[PDB]
Amino acid sequence: GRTVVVTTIMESPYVMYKKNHEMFEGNDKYEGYCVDLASEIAKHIGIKYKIAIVPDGKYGARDADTKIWNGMVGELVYGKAEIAIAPLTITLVREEVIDFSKPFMSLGISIMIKKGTPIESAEDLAKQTEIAYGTLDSGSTKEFFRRSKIAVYEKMWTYMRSAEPSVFTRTTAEGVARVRKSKGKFAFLLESTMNEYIEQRKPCDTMKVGGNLDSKGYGVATPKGSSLRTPVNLAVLKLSEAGVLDKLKNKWWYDKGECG
Amino acid sequence: GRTVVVTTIMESPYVMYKKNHEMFEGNDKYEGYCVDLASEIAKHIGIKYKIAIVPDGKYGARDADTKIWNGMVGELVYGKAEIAIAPLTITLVREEVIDFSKPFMSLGISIMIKKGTPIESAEDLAKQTEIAYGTLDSGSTKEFFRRSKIAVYEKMWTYMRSAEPSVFTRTTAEGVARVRKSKGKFAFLLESTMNEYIEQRKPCDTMKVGGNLDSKGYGVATPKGSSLRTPVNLAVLKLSEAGVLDKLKNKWWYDKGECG
Ligand SMILES: N[C@@H](CCC(=O)O)C(=O)O
Ligand SMILES: N[C@@H](CCC(=O)O)C(=O)O
């Protein structure tokens, strides 16, 4: 082709297995927002591609000891993949080692509760101890709390980093399941995009509360020096300006929403 | 050691004259969100700078016949400024001729009405002729309507492009004044950021209605090949992650809002 290796992550509704995925081959085993975005970008830039789910299941963080990058970021840094098409947050530490397109989606950190939990804000979580709260490992939300100098978020970090049993989860699905099973005694910090999707799905027992804690974006990532950098950036901007990104968000979040 | 020329535009609350500006020299004549942002970026990247208000008062568009770029985009393209620090929208046609940082603000096109105007959406505007509407000349909003292939926006463009008297204004302030004087018979299409600011200012007679028409961002722009490109991008990401951009938006929009 060449057949370009695209790293991504299993995260609803971005990349999901189709019903009866075991009868399909290759790229056709998957569906979701990023599966459609990959198809659109590949058409615009004129590449053949193969979806490769990140082996360790992580977004990407650098180890304090070894300074080795894991997740999708690592797949790009170490030359295993040529492009990451996923809900991968544009951050300073990642921009130092990979390139990102302009954002294809705008978002912020948010709070997920089980319906009826007496929490409306981050300040509400920080000033109490009955309701535990946590976030995803190896991603931008955990780094946000680790680095914040805003007093409320500092207090939240000081609690989460030492909480027993652990409040951190290896996947978003694990955090959502923990909210649903914990009878109102666990809240989960996650991006507004994920939170809004889950709120639209049965059993319709969770909701997003309060405003977003920050304002940022997801971008399509390429390794430094890639000839795909500019074609990818221009493709994302063309798709944005043609309304395709809005159409795809509606397709995967709202058009078949299940919770009224 | 050089004093870097920064192009910007008079647009509230991004760049405004201080009270009694005439008794100040150079950069000290101005205040606003972008004045503060310029100071922050200059400190991070270690440059001296001089604010130069764009002589033609335009954001930037390309002439179809002469192929010449005007506005702030032109100042960068033709080597008259080294940075643009302004509410300059990241678009495909601009990305082809200049570079942009990752976004420092997220926004979309929105509708401004005189309070009481029976309009809640773009669809409402397009299906009637009793209320006129327009937008700024030489910017991204006008280009949005010109280029749209979505039915409602096509209808709106077809009306606006032939309307007489002209519904395109030279400045945002002109458009706002036209809304305020027209007894509900003129509405204005402008970015949500500028709409939200005006709604917080006396005489508190305008408001934003409906959702935004699109989702995009403002970036700090540099000419292609600039040694400032990476320093600027990293500074914006640092200011974002540190919460400084949020503090600046609150300072200039909400902290002293006048309309409840
Ligand atoms: N989008 C995040 C993952 C989710 C999260 O950290 O909440 C990242 O790129 O790391
Ligand atoms: N931010 C716009 C100007 C305002 C508008 O077009 O509404 C631009 O960069 O062109």
Short mmCIF file of C-alpha atoms and ligand atoms in Angstrom, two decimals, chain B residues 11 59-60 72 87-91 94 107 109 135-143 172 188-191 194 218, ligand 2:
data_model
loop_
_atom_site.label_atom_id
_atom_site.label_comp_id
_atom_site.label_asym_id
_atom_site.label_seq_id
_atom_site.Cartn_x
_atom_site.Cartn_y
_atom_site.Cartn_z
CA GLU B 11 -12.31 44.00 19.60
CA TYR B 59 -9.32 39.59 10.56
CA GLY B 60 -8.19 38.20 7.21
CA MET B 72 -4.10 40.18 10.44
CA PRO B 87 -9.53 36.19 18.51
CA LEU B 88 -8.39 34.70 15.20
CA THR B 89 -10.33 31.56 14.18
CA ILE B 90 -8.40 28.46 13.12
CA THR B 91 -9.63 27.61 9.60
CA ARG B 94 -5.73 30.08 6.85
CA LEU B 107 -16.27 28.80 20.53
CA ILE B 109 -21.06 30.82 15.66
CA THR B 135 -22.61 39.15 10.13
CA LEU B 136 -19.10 40.66 10.15
CA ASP B 137 -17.28 41.24 6.80
CA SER B 138 -13.83 39.64 6.07
CA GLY B 139 -14.02 36.92 8.69
CA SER B 140 -14.66 33.28 9.34
CA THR B 141 -18.42 33.64 10.05
CA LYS B 142 -19.14 35.11 6.61
CA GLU B 143 -17.03 32.37 5.02
CA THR B 172 -18.52 43.68 15.46
CA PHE B 188 -26.52 39.35 14.27
CA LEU B 189 -24.47 36.19 13.70
CA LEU B 190 -21.24 36.30 15.67
CA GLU B 191 -19.01 34.04 17.72
CA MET B 194 -18.23 37.97 21.71
CA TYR B 218 -8.97 30.64 18.31
N1 LIG C 2 -12.83 35.33 14.77
C1 LIG C 2 -13.28 35.66 13.37
C2 LIG C 2 -13.85 37.09 13.26
C3 LIG C 2 -15.24 37.23 13.78
C4 LIG C 2 -16.33 36.56 12.92
O1 LIG C 2 -16.11 36.29 11.71
O2 LIG C 2 -17.44 36.34 13.47
C5 LIG C 2 -12.13 35.49 12.40
O3 LIG C 2 -11.03 35.06 12.81
O4 LIG C 2 -12.31 35.77 11.22
#
